Amino acid sequence: AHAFWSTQPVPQTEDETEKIVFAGPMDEPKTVADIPEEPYPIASTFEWWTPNMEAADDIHAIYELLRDNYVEDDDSMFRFNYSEEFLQWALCPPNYIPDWHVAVRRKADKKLLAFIAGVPVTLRMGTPKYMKVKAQEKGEGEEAAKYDEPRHICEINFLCVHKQLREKRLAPILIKEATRRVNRTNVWQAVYTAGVLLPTPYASGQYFHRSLNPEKLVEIRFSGIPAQYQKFQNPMAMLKRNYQLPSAPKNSGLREMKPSDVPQVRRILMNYLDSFDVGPVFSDAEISHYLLPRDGVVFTYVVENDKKVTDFFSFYRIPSTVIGNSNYNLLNAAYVHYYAATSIPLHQLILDLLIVAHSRGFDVCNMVEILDNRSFVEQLKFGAGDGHLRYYFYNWAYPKIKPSQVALVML
Numbered sequence: 093a094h095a096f097w098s099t100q101p102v103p104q105t106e107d108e109t110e111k112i113v114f115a116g117p118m119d120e121p122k123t124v125a126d127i128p129e130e131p132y133p134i135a136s137t138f139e140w141w142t143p144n145m146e147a148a149d150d151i152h153a154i155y156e157l158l159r160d161n162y163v164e165d166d167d168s169m170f171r172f173n174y175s176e177e178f179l180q181w182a183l184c185p186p187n188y189i190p191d192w193h194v195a196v197r198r199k200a201d202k203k204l205l206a207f208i209a210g211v212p213v214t215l216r217m218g219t220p221k222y223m224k225v226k227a228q229e230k231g232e233g234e235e236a237a238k239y240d241e242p243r244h245i246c247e248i249n250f251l252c253v254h255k256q257l258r259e260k261r262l263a264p265i266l267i268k269e270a271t272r273r274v275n276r277t278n279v280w281q282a283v284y285t286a287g288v289l290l291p292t293p294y295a296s297g298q299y300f301h302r303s304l305n306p307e308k309l310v311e312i313r314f315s316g317i318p319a320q321y322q323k324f325q326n327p328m329a330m331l332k333r334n335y336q337l338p339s340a341p342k343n344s345g346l347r348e349m350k351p352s353d354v355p356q357v358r359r360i361l362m363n364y365l366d367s368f369d370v371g372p373v374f375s376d377a378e379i380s381h382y383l384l385p386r387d388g389v390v391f392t393y394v395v396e397n398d399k400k401v402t403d404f405f406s407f408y409r410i411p412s413t414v415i416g417n418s419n420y421n422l423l424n425a426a427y428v429h430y431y432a433a434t435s436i437p438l439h440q441l442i443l444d445l446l447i448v449a450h451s452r453g454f455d456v457c458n459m460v461e462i463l464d465n466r467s468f469v470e471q472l473k474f475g476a477g478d479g480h481l482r483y484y485f486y487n488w489a490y491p492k493i494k495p496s497q498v499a500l501v502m503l
């Protein structure tokens with residue numbers, strides 16, 4: 093039973109979801125003038141706060157709340173440790189709305205107790221192909237197509253309640269106040285993901301990881317040496333052999349992405365993302381923000397042939413705190429971000445991702461089975477983790493789709 097989510101304009105059951113035939117709004121059409129001008133009421137010892145993402149001390153505050161209190165895995169082996177530089181990057185894309193970043197602080201000492209962030213995203217989120225076909229079969233083409241144009245909506249991330257304040261219903265208050273700020277901006281949909289089941293996902297996928305430094309990985313979690321390896325003479329040398337990578341990229345013509353590559357990257361990325369039912373649209377400014385290399389944050393490489401960019405990949409860095417270890421308190425993880433291949437097989441492109449990551453000191457490469465990530469799992473020796481990432485809309489009816497029909501990477 094769901095005392096908050098039952099009240100919200102989301103599909104409430106899988107049964108309800110299975111029934112959905114067209115993309116479209118759930119809720120009453122509303123107008124900005126209907127929405128309360130003032131912040132949602134909160135207890136007199138709490139105050140709403142809009143952090144200034146240009147203030148190092150505000151970013152620091154958010155950083156520490158998330159370092160101590162954000163996402164842990166089911167077994168509490170790790171907790172994400174997103175960096176200050178990463179947060180400034182993720183929270184401040186072009187045309188971001190400062191008012192969309194919502195915090196609660198304790199009035200007396202200004203201790204940050206909770207946070208949620210929204211950023212703009214331009215998302216294709218019209219009726220998926222398999223449902224459009226079914227629509228043509230019913231005569232229902234126009235309805236199925238009504239909402240095809242990319243929409244300017246809200247992408248929610250970084251919801252976090254301090255461990256001291258858990259299970260006191262503070263999260264629904266944060267979501268209501270975020271929903272108010274976004275609505276006042278004349279935006280009525282959001283997209284968000286979670287590693288937990290909520291009412292009700294439009295897509296779900298497994299996590300997949302690829303060891304880059306198996307020595308350091310056993311030393312934490314991987315249950316020491318992976319069980320299947322114990323059964324031989326020298327497990328660690330065998331493990332290292334399994335995961336070993338070349339020192340330098342295999343693709344000649346691979347180089348770091350530069351500002352003048354922005355138009356070409358935008359084109360091959362947009363062409364590639366059209367094959368997916370749900371996916372982002374990026375302007376030149378957004379391509380530049382999300383994909384231009386930034387030290388310790390995002391890394392992006394292009395294959396340039398004959399002075400033309402024909403392929404590219406990107407990955408971003410999220411360290412995790414290793415929850416109970418000594419020798420090793422940090423896990424240095426690289427996450428697969430956007431890419432596009434047109435001159436080589438995807439696995440050959442992504443092998444260079446792994447080589448670059450390994451060369452730069454990353455311990456593991458992580459991803460969700462979105463995009464065409466499944467097409468290189470086996471050859472590049474990725475293994476499924478215990479995670480599942482569920483994708484959700486707020487105020488949007490959407491048929492269930494496979495994760496391989498999802499092109500939105502969640503930072």
Ligand SMILES: CCCCCCCCCCCCCC(=O)SCCNC(=O)CCNC(=O)[C@H](O)C(C)(C)COP(=O)(O)OP(=O)(O)OC[C@H]1O[C@@H](n2cnc3c(N)ncnc32)[C@H](O)[C@@H]1OP(=O)(O)O
Nearest residue numbers: 094095096097162250251252253258259260261262263280
């Ligand atoms: C148009 C614009 C719309 C904009 C907004 C779109 C909606 C955005 C929605 C948010 C998208 C976030 C995307 C991400 O960032 S996903 C990452 C979420 N963050 C973490 O997991 C960090 C560690 N955990 C925590 O900080 C807390 O446990 C959280 C904050 C998750 C819950 O706090 P707490 O444990 O102290 O509980 P409560 O008593 O305050 O609240 C209980 C209610 O909260 C519902 N709950 C539990 N976990 C989540 C979850 N991940 N998404 C949405 N709802 C969740 C739960 O079912 C229950 O409602 P109900 O079952 O009684 O009905």
Ligand SMILES: COC(=O)c1ccc(N2CCCCCC2)c(NS(=O)(=O)c2ccc(OC)cc2)c1
Nearest residue numbers: 163164165170171172287299301412477478479
């Ligand atoms: C908060 O999660 C982490 O920080 C993390 C870091 C690394 C992970 N894996 C697990 C396998 C061995 C260690 C490296 C790769 C994993 N395992 S995971 O299976 O990728 C995973 C990722 C996110 C998630 O969100 C609730 C649950 C599971 C998690």
